[PDB]
């Protein structure tokens, strides 16, 4: 399983307040968490918590 | 040594609780809790003399 983060045209992650307009969208630009990006602040922590929130039931 | 005013200093015994996840130090002095934010300049300038004058 591979996690990706939604970003805009400038590779700035989209805040959660726009979630309703991202789920309805189909051509969202995404950055994969496998490749480390030093320009995004707290990218490693965000990808970590993304992977961690998967294993709630298990 | 805790300065209760600009020119008055008194010896005191304090307790410190540090939480680095949020970056705050709670100092129990005279039975009262004082919360210092480590991201605030005035809180730093108040807390640091207390820490550096400890013995």
């Amino acid at each position: 399983i591979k996690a990706k983060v939604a970003v805009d045209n400038k590779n700035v992650p989209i805040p959660c307040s726009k979630i309703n307009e991202v789920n309805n969208n189909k051509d969202v630009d995404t950055l994969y968490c496998d490749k480390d990006r030093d320009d995004i602040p707290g990218f490693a922590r965000s990808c970590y918590r993304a992977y961690s929130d998967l294993f709630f039931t298990t | 040594a805790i300065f209760t005013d600009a020119s008055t200093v008194a010896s005191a015994q304090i307790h410190l609780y540090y939480n680095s996840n949020i970056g705050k130090i709670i100092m129990s002095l005279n039975g009262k809790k004082h919360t210092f934010n480590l991201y605030d300049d005035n809180d730093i300038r108040t807390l640091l003399p207390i820490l550096l004058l400890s013995k």
Binding site: - | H15, G31, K32, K33, H34, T35, D40, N42, D43
Partner: protein, 201 residues
């Protein structure tokens, strides 16, 4: 700040950084613009240290500039556990512990509690009340493999004290096996395996 020439500038300057030593020393001049500016500041940030210092400064001469602020805070943050003496959580009884009744709740009239959370009427009625109680206070307790027990049974009751309840025996007495029997099986099976291997070879 011994004259009101800096009042107009500092009024807007100190709303950005109310913890500045210059702002607090301007407040300490005790003029109406300073106290009103800090009343407006503290009606939203009453849970900040500079508001404790502001309350210490104004009272008892100009308590009216703090109480109002407190009111606003405690009507916006009604869920704050610190506004539960000035604004009791009960819907009908919000003024339950106002005035001399502040001493009917011993949490409100506590030395550890900060006095910015009480109205001035509650503050002056805090020290003149009588507590016929029976209390134990420990400032610090560092336990290192110890078993402290701070009991205070104090009103005259039955002298005899019942034994402490031990709980229930959750563990069940399952049918066990002999302790040596696993070792016996291990040694016997190892010897038999070795004997068959030697014989067949």
């Amino acid at each position: 700040y011994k004259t009101e020439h800096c009042d107009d500038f500092m009024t807007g300057f100190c709303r950005n950084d109310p913890g500045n030593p210059n702002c607090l020393e301007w407040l300490r001049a005790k003029r109406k613009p300073a106290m009103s500016t800090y009343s407006d500041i503290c009606s939203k940030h009453m849970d900040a240290r500079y508001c404790s210092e502001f309350i210490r400064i104004i009272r008892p001469d100009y308590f009216t500039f703090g109480d109002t602020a407190l009111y606003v805070f405690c009507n916006d943050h009604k869920g704050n556990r610190n506004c539960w003496c000035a604004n009791y959580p009960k819907s009908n009884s919000g003024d339950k512990y106002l005035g001399p009744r502040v001493c009917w709740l011993h949490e409100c009239t506590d030395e550890s509690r900060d006095r910015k959370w009480l109205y001035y009427n509650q503050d002056v009625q805090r020290t003149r009340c009588k507590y016929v109680g029976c209390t134990i206070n420990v400032n610090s307790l560092a336990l290192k493999n110890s078993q402290a027990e701070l009991t205070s049974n104090c009103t005259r009751t039955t002298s005899a004290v019942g034994d402490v309840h031990p709980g229930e025996p959750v563990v069940k007495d399952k049918i066990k096996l002999p302790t040596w029997l696993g070792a016996a099986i291990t040694l016997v099976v190892i010897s038999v395996i070795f004997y068959f291997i030697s014989i067949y070879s």
